[PDB]
Amino acid sequence: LETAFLERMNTLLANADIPDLFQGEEYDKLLNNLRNKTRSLGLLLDTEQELYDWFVGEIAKNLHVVF
Amino acid sequence: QFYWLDLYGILGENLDIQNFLPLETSKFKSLSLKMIKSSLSTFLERQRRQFPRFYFLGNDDLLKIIGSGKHHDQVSKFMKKMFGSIESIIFFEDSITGVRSVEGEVLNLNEKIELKDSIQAQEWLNILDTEIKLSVFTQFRDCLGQLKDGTDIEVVVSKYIFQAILLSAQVMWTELVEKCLQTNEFSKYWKEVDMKIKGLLDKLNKSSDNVKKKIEALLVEYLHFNNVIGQLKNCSTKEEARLLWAKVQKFYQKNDTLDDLNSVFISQSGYLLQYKFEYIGIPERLIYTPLLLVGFATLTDSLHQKYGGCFFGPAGTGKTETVKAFGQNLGRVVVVFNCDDSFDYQVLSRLLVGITQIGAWGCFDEFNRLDEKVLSAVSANIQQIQNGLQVGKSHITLLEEETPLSPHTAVFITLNPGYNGRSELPENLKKSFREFSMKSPQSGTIAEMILQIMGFEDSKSLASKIVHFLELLSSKCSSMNHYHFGLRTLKGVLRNCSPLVSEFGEGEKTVVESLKRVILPSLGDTDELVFKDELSKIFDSNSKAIVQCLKDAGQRSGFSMSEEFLKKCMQFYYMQKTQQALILVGKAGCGKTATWKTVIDAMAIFDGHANVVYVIDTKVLTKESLYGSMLKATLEWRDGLFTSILRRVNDDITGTFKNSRIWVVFDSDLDPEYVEAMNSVLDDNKILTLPNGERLPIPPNFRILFETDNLDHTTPATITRCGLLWFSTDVCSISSKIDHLLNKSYEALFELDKLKDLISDSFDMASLTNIFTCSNDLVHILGVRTFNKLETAVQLAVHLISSYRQWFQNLDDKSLKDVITLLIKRSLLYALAGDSTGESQRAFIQTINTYFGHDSQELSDYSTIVILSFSSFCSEIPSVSLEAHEVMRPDIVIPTIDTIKHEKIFYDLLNSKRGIILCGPPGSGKTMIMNNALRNSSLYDVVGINFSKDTTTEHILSALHRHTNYVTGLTLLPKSDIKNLVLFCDQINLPKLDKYGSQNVVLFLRQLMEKQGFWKTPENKWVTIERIHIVGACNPPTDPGRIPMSERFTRHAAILYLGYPSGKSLSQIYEIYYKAIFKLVPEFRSYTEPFARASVHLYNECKARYSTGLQSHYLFSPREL
Amino acid sequence: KKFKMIMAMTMFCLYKFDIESEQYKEAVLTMIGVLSESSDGVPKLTNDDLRYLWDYVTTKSYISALNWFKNEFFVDEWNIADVVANSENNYFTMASERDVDGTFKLIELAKASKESLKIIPLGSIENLNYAQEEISKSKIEGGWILLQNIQMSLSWVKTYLHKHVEETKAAEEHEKFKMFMTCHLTGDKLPAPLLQRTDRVVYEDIPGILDTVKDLWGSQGVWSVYCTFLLSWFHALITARTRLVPHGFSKKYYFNDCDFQFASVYLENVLATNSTNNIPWAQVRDHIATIVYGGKIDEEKDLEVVAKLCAHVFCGSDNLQIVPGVRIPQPLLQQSEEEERARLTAILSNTIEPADSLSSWLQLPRESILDYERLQAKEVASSTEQLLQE
């Protein structure tokens, strides 16, 4: 509908994540969620770097886009 | 304790406002304080209604003025905003005894105004406004009485304010000239006015400051009197005399009525205007010319029927000041607004409400800058005002509120048609105004009269020569945009003559020096020659201290004081004495920043004043971040960066700005949608007008510098207001720049002192000259001038040589010379030919070896240094043994010599802290090489951004949100305290150009590299960057959709070109891949070679066969393999 | 203008070609070929209207050659007031080019109709909301509403308005409602749906000199009416001169009712204080040349042209030869205002504007206006010939 839509779909394929979707408290919540999910999988990820790396890796693994 | 005290003084200790703020009063008692403070806007509007001039005060200003009714200190400080002509209130014994004008004139009141704590600001200010009107009238009455009795003009000027003496003189002149018009006796009266002119002109030389100003203005008026009287004396018939006399303004007094303040009126062309007796002080008066008089005639004709006045024409012809002088002649002061596209229906409607209720005359400057939509929408309000005045209505409705219509108002518009960024008025709006063309002012008369006032020996000859010389320059100079020799240039010359009168002696020498200082700094070589020759043809005929200050500043900072550099410093220094607005135009890297920093530092040495400089990047910031914005949802104004700086300077809470200069540098391209907002700031108005209604003055010591490299989209509206300094060529030679760069790089570091001598000897200018000269002949992809590539050479060479300090203590002289020589050759190679192709680089190695000497250490394709001894990369390539599954990995790079060379040079550049740009065809391996190089490091983390057409600075900052912390200027640091950040910028050249050809994101990156910081817009604070590096990559600026990047950006980064690997290289790489795969099926491993050959052959033939000339998406690259 | 002449010629041909004989048809086609410059020739004349047309074409009276068709066949022509007064519709769209606006035509209309006309310009949300409310009110209660510059807010023209107009196609139940819309012919496209349901009127200047002075005079103590008559002639002549862009004035200019109104105000103000009949004609000339009309003029040559016309008209002679036709004597102070108005109206109505008024009345070279007039005729005739072929 807008060119802004492209700016998302470009980013989403240039990089696994869209940083604009997880700013401020949205970032904090994400990490918290990841921690819980991490604990639910028997994994040990301590830092925000480890958690976010796992997040983006899983995104790259699971999401497929068909235009 | 601040917030409670602030709202207590405002809201707490006040039991009268509770009848209008009972909720906030109770809420304050309970106490959130901030929200209550923001909730008082309704009461502030109530208070504005009780004193219309309050519309020119901000909400904070009303809070202060309402609060401190017990001191009467703050109310004085706002006179400059409420009345304009009045600086302050003169109190005594808790009563007002007078007011002090801007020029320093003191107006006494007929009766002291007794003040009480219970009397609110609006009440006794209304009393003061009536008293000021009465006092001005009283002095007019008495002065006219004495002058008419036969008192001499020279013994009355020292007794009364300027307005009284002026209006008495005008009324008497009208009466006496009309009596002369009754007959043909004009000779006697011409002689009388001539004698008065001589007397005042001689008295001028023996006077105080105020008396001097009064006499100068009276001399302007009397020169007009004499010119008119002479013309009537020289008419042929009675009808000619009547025809001429009907066209000038006549000052009559209703001596037969009872109404005092309305007793004086002005007659012109059969129409009458009412004199107001508002106090205006002692403003600079305009020399009278025919154009000025005809403009007054049209304005009178329009005001007779209550139509809006309008002036149109090219920039620099005196429209707005004609409007102001008309207002001055009618005993009133015109409020001037600077229109912008930040205005909309609400802003213009509110401003019209203010002008309506005040009874003021308002002038809207640059009226075309309003967008089309608001120009259409506000026509209804314009029409309603006209109809209300014509009919005689008592109220009009604006913005859904009925407000009184003060029957004194007028609306004037000044517009420049046909300029970039301007719009067109719709027909139903133009029909409400009476237009008049102001295309060409009579510059000769202006020059003659100004010179006559200044006491020059021969005003006629000098005026003729000056105006003729300006015309000759405008006719003979080359065709360039920034050549304007119109009225503003004449005023610049004449104003610069004033401080130089005693330097040269009231003669031609002053004029020629002023001409040189004003005009030469803006000319090129051809036009410099033309100027000097023409000045010699037309005209007949000690800086040591500041020169030494400049020498000291330059040498201390470390910049070579070349002759060109000193010349430009001197021109800048002389220009900035009288110009508060300077533009510095020159090529990227030519030395504008060096020039203005050196000159300001020299001035600091000379005068002993402090210098605070703010550097703003106009294009990176949006207008709502630069000039501020009103949030209409709350009607709350919030300052931008420039507005915040100006407000803080004006506040001057600690007096820190009283013995200092304030410099604001706009370090980006001039843009007519940004800079024009400051028109009334740059020109004689010296006022910043904000949409909310505030009017911030510009201090006399507040200077603005513009730094750019072009004047393509800049209109004469800005070029003719600012003094312009033109840099034709770089300010210094290559040798001087290398000396500076080497000194700065070394100083940033016994051992280092002998190493410095060795390095300096190695950069022997003799051979570098030829190396640069023949380097200029190569093909440079996304290239930069040699002058802006030297920085990479020096920086990388110093870094590389210092990196081997640990092993220099045990070397002999030959070894030290060889290591230094090889490192400098390699650094020079990558600095000059780094952006060229492989064959060009090898040929350039050959030329380097040729010019540094047969007996020097040889540089070769793959030479290197190992722990010391000399070796080559070609012998240091390990083999790789992959397992089959590892062909699916993204982080595998099969090693090869060309890869090793790229990785080594990239890592060396990054360690030296030089920003990096990679350039090459798609798939050539830019990101792969950059990822592999930093993958195995322990010093850097990598943050990647993908740039695109519609990305902005916001995306770039958001990319660092999870990697960086803001730590109290403010600092931005990586979250980790052990590694730095390398911020990749993928496809840096895709972001599109705006309507004026600029990339805001690339300029933002330039600011990050050059200034190591940026402005945080919501808080308007400076953020310093400590440990973030900038690298990026792009395709060459020849592929479709790529935007060429300006030299001002690319000069700050080394550029490395990365082409495709050769056929044999691809064959070997993919043979290794197939060898890895065939481990799955080892019985076919004998076919590893032919399969790789087939794949590479098929790739090559597909790439050659199916080109983009068939389909836009037929792109083939090694990625497919 | 152009399309009105093209339509006049086209309909004349469509009627006569089938009504009249073949020789009539072939003559008219030869004549269109002559005017369009596509073909030479002489019609067979035995048929005096074709002859009169032939006299105009030979004599290079090209605008007269075009007006021949319109005058010969068509016996009526409507104005804005005719369209509004005689129409089953209640929505009206007026259109013009840049620097031409007929809002005053509507205000004069509304005053003559004793109707309350409210004018709202569009382009902002405030005016849009107020306009929606006022549109609703003038229907349940009545009144005239004008929406100026609707193209400024197409996003509202193409939504709300594209809707309410169809709803009022339906109600037709209130007699005292009329909505007026203005737009620019050089602007953006309005939605076909809406333009189709609206009475469309094109506003433009009157082409003829005598027609212009006649209209201005019809819109309106002996000195007052006499000066008004002279001013009407002056306005007509100067406005006609503006049509010769490369020969009349150096630059294109526009003059409108406000300049006439200001000149009238100044003339009345001068007459008010000169009871001796010693009218300061020099002051009148200088003011009209310099301020009322000269204010728009930014070139010395064009202002000199204006000064020449002022010197010609407001000379103050006893009997002015304002054109090669009518001579205007001065009034007698013994006559009544009605008497002098009748005399001046008789002087105006008794004369004839010649075929070459573009030269003689404007004092232009006849070879200069020839290219102008002939090229207009060429375009009109070429378009008509193309239409007739199809």
Ligand SMILES: Nc1ncnc2c1ncn2[C@@H]1O[C@H](COP(=O)(O)OP(=O)(O)OP(=O)(O)O)[C@@H](O)[C@H]1O
């Ligand atoms: N009669 C006069 N006497 C002295 N100076 C004059 C006179 N008339 C004009 N000037 C000079 O003209 C300049 C005033 O021009 P002004 O600021 O009104 O320009 P402008 O038309 O508003 O410009 P722009 O179109 O760029 O906004 C000042 O230099 C003023 O000194």
Ligand SMILES: Nc1ncnc2c1ncn2[C@@H]1O[C@H](COP(=O)(O)OP(=O)(O)OP(=O)(O)O)[C@@H](O)[C@H]1O
């Ligand atoms: N007199 C001098 N002697 C030696 N080096 C100099 C001298 N003047 C300038 N330089 C060098 O030349 C360059 C001048 O660039 P500067 O920082 O002044 O910006 P600029 O030319 O205005 O460019 P831009 O508009 O891109 O910021 C710097 O490398 C400075 O070190």
Ligand SMILES: Nc1ncnc2c1ncn2[C@@H]1O[C@H](COP(=O)(O)OP(=O)(O)OP(=O)(O)O)[C@@H](O)[C@H]1O
């Ligand atoms: N040892 C190697 N040498 C050269 N190329 C290799 C090697 N190993 C793999 N490659 C391939 O080389 C190509 C490198 O291109 P890469 O994908 O890095 O493009 P890029 O630099 O990001 O391009 P663009 O500018 O189009 O975004 C990839 O196909 C990679 O698989």
